[PDB]
Amino acid sequence: KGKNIQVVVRCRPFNLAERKASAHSIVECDPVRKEVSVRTGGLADKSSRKTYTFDMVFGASTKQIDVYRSVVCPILDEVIMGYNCTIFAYGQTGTGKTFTMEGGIIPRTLHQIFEKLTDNGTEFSVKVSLLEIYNEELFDLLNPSSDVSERLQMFDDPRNKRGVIIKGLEEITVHNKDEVYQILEKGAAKRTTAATLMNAYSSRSHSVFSVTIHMKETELVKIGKLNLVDLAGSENIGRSGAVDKRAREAGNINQSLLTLGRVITALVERTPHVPYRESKLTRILQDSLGGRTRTSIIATISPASLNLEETLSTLEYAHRAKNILNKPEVNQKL
Template identity: 55%
Template sequence: MEGGARKKNGEFPGDAGVIPRAVRQIFNILGAQCAKYNMKVTFLELYNEEITDLLAPEEVTKFIDDKSKKPIALMEDGKGGVFVRGLEEEIVTTANQIYKILEKGCAKKRTADTLLNKQSSRSHSILSITIHIKECTPEGEEMIKCGKLNLVDLAGLENISRSGAREGRAREAGEINKSLLTLGRVINALVEHSSHVPYRDSKLTRLLRDSLGGKTKTCIIATISPSLYCLEETLSTLDYAHRAKNIKNRPEINQKMMKSAMIKDLYSEIGRLKQELYASREKNGIYIPSDRYLQEEEEKKVQFVE
């Protein structure tokens, strides 16, 4: 997904991965259209079923393994999807800025040397790019079109005995395998049109819910090896890809809304944030507005029933 690093003169490397190539194409298209746009980026890591913000300030990430620290919350958005509360959003205007964000985030990702891979990923990561493009109707009314691209780098399914993983590394591998096996069950359930799809069994499948049978276009790239030693991993990966091909998504065109309606929504969001700030300062036992607390309690009840 990342590929080779940029050269010192800023030249685009020939072995660049999917993410930098996608970023370059996005800016080429926007430049050709002379579009007026706003773009923001988030970058998260899923390690041992805990979400880490790869763009968080250094003083925050220093205490990332502190057990007393409250983990980043994965919330329902009320529309059948999920969102990660509190992620840092970087506003970008050039491809080079995203390349730097990618380098900054990848430097924080967990990797380790195993018998199968000198730089084995010990976590999954998702780089999200959200773009708002301004358009005008024939009547002169301004409209905003919104699109989002999620670029997901999955850690590989690992044979613990062959990788040489021990103690902490073995536990990491167990969590990686657990989330990937859940992903496999979700894929099977969708292909077989099962009445229950176990999205909630892993944070990975909850994050990828819209990409698996949802409203997005999804592409899976299977990384395999010609080595006979890796035959088991190659067959497992190809089986994943073959089953995933049979999932039917229902893509929808990028959302468009009137600029005035979007401004109204932003005012509502500002009002909600002010309420939360006021409730936090009061410190009377509830650190969020009471209506938000009741809403989240109802969501928990629904999750428990499911």
């Protein structure tokens, strides 16, 4: 059941780096269409095109706020219902993982969350967490109080097999928006991963930011949870010419990305075994995968012809994502 997992594609305005690249926008975004078309060339020159039709499609032009509004606001209501929701950003850094996170998205969100809840008037508490997945290890950003790595182990809580429990991380509740920001600023610093040669900044680690909201009204008690996941991406080591350690780390994640593509193809498969446990990320994710959790994916792509692989890889992904059946259920609790 659940609504199908929602997938939107965003094409970045040609990155300045792209411009230095003199990358050319093969990519065409027809937001009316919600079509995105890529000059593959096929074998042929990229007269050849590959065209996809998307749940939502944003050209470079698409303004950030708009995106959010269209994607976040509906999620926020689900959180207030008790939904568990997750939004994952995939794509290129140029495409604006960074463009998206630098600005909101996070700072904007906590303000709105309190505003909607308090207008709701529900008695509520808000707790946040921020961790980074680096080379298959967990590190607490959110609480500098907590360690650089939050004490991280995960077990099954029997209620949901997919449902898991991450012992030791603490979210600290604050009724006010303000307290959250103070954490927010703190968290960010911890969050930051390694910069890259190619990009000023890169996400070495996948970042998972989670906001849990406890709501009580006269008595019905609901709990809403939102996970904002920012993909960690690798570049070809060979291209990078990065130090071996750097290459290695990139390779690990990169390889992990294949693993991620493998599980995804399984989900498409509806194959008996879904390799959630092969990554900590997909295990944590695990209950969300077409799961009860209401999930949305924002795939960012570069018009640049230069990176064939990523464009192809994204395209493949977008197909795979739909296949898995997302059963968001409002996790409304009384």
